[PDB]
């Protein structure tokens, strides 16, 4: 058994989104297929299930009229017509097989990302985080390298080819006005920073942005 889904989808608010569900390794049109909505914040909410054989559909009382499923008997694929989409439904969608009153939910999908916004794909903006001019030299010192104004996700902010990998921290993406802003930090001994050359590198595959930047003291 194996399940396939469509790739990432972006669109302006108000239009429709079509996502496909492919199933193999079993009788595709013999039992229910249900989809799950996972908001990137919390909770799991379902959207509905369909039986690819007959036109038997049901919906949750909260998401009535928001999506309309569709099945195909010739090709083993399930579709979903999406109604007027708002910025409150941008979440991840899973598909799964289900058979009521008996053994059920033994497999899943892989995950499909739906990012609905109004911004435009912009290259990142890299900036160093240098400490202040007046600072007390302790036994160790922390670092910083920031990336602002990029879309869409993801981005890979690393140090010099993995040389400084212990004590790194990458935070989730959070918006400020309309775009993202992510920082990277690591702690290094204070007797090494004035000597060893360190450079933070940023890789954005969606825009093909490979930018390195050296951090120098004041």
């Amino acid at each position: 058994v194996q399940l396939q889904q469509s790739g990432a989808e972006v669109m302006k608010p108000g239009a429709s989104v079509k996502i496909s569900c492919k199933g193999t390794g079993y009788t595709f049109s013999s039992y229910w297929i249900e989809w799950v909505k996972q908001r990137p914040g919390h909770g799991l909410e379902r959207i509905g299930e369909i039986l690819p054989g007959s036109g038997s559909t049901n919906y949750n009382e909260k998401f009535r009229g928001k999506a309309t499923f569709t099945a195909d008997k010739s090709s083993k694929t399930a579709y979903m017509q999406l109604s007027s989409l708002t910025s409150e439904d941008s979440a991840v969608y899973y598909c799964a097989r289900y058979l009521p009153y008996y053994y059920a939910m033994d497999y899943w999908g892989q995950g499909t990302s739906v990012t609905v916004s109004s911004a435009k794909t912009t290259p990142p903006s890299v900036y160093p985080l240098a400490p202040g001019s007046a600072a007390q030299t302790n036994s160790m010192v922390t670092l910083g390298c920031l990336v602002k104004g990029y879309f869409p996700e993801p981005v890979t902010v690393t140090w010099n080819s993995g040389s400084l990998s212990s004590g790194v921290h990458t935070f989730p993406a959070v918006l400020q006005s309309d775009l993202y802003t992510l920082s990277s930090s690591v702690t290094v001994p204070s007797s090494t920073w004035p000597s060893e050359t360190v450079t933070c590198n940023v890789a954005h595959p969606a825009s093909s942005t490979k930018v390195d930047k050296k951090i120098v003291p004041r």
């Binding site: 249900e34 799950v36 919390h42 909770g43 799991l44 909410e45 379902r46 509905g48 299930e49 049901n58 919906y59 949750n60 009382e61 899973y94 009521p100 009153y101 053994y103 059920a104 939910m105 033994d106 899943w108 999908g109 892989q110 995950g111 903006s125 900036y127 160093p128 985080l129 240098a130 400490p131 202040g132 001019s133 007046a134 922390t142 910083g144 920031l146 602002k148 004590g167 921290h169 990458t170 935070f171 989730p172 959070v174 400020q176 802003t181 920082s183 930090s185 702690t187």
Partner: protein, 218 residues
């Protein structure tokens, strides 16, 4: 719709301890046939959920014996004997009695260890962002426990809340600590009119808030 109530919301337990989580139904979910149909789901960060317990009186084919499930006609309890490094994740309930089907609230489950001292580090903007025309002040708080911590921004002694980006990650594996990033974005013209910028932290393991302040004109 029959809502689930999972207790508690978060149950930090150490390695080797027995942890029990209750999942109560708002109505009776016992079917007239004589069998109650409930599913337990385990979701890991960045992966699709797995199966551990279907038909609570039974066990899934492929899960080790460390998991168990029990309960009366309405109250249900999932029990774990020895929490391992693999058992990290999020739990979910699923009722299969009435139409339609719905999920639970989601139970957060991680490991627990002793307290840690937070590491606070402030970073003023660099010369590159000044050439651009902005001011990004970053405040990292790494290696602290528990999540009970508050971050406050002061400008010349006044509380500031606009432009605050607060982000946090999950519990790391090698050190089992927490991290929190606080970013403050302002214009360069405002950076030349104020004097003192301060990141303050209040945590349980500190009787006094950790203060990190810096002045513009020094």
């Amino acid at each position: 719709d029959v809502l689930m109530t999972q207790t508690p919301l978060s149950l930090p337990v150490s390695l080797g301890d027995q942890a029990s989580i209750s999942c109560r139904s708002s109505q009776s979910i016992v079917h007239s046939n004589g069998n109650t149909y409930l599913e337990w789901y385990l979701q890991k960060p960045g992966q699709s959920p797995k199966l551990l317990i279907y038909k609570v009186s039974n066990r899934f084919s492929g899960v080790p014996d460390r998991f168990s499930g029990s309960g009366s006609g309405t109250d249900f309890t999932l029990k774990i004997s020895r929490v391992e490094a693999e058992d990290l994740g999020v739990y979910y309930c699923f009722q299969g009695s009435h139409v339609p089907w719905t999920f639970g609230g989601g139970t957060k489950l991680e490991i627990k260890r002793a307290d840690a001292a937070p590491t606070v580090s402030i970073f003023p903007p660099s010369s590159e962002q000044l050439t651009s025309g902005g001011a990004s002040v970053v405040c990292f708080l790494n290696n602290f426990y528990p999540k009970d911590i508050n971050v406050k921004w002061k400008i010349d002694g006044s509380e500031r809340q606009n432009g605050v980006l607060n982000s946090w990650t999950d519990q790391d594996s090698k050190d089992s600590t927490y991290s929190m990033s606080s970013t403050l974005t302002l214009t360069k013209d405002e950076y030349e009119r104020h004097n003192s910028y301060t990141c303050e932290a209040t945590h349980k393991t500190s009787t006094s808030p950790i203060v990190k302040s810096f002045n513009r004109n020094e």
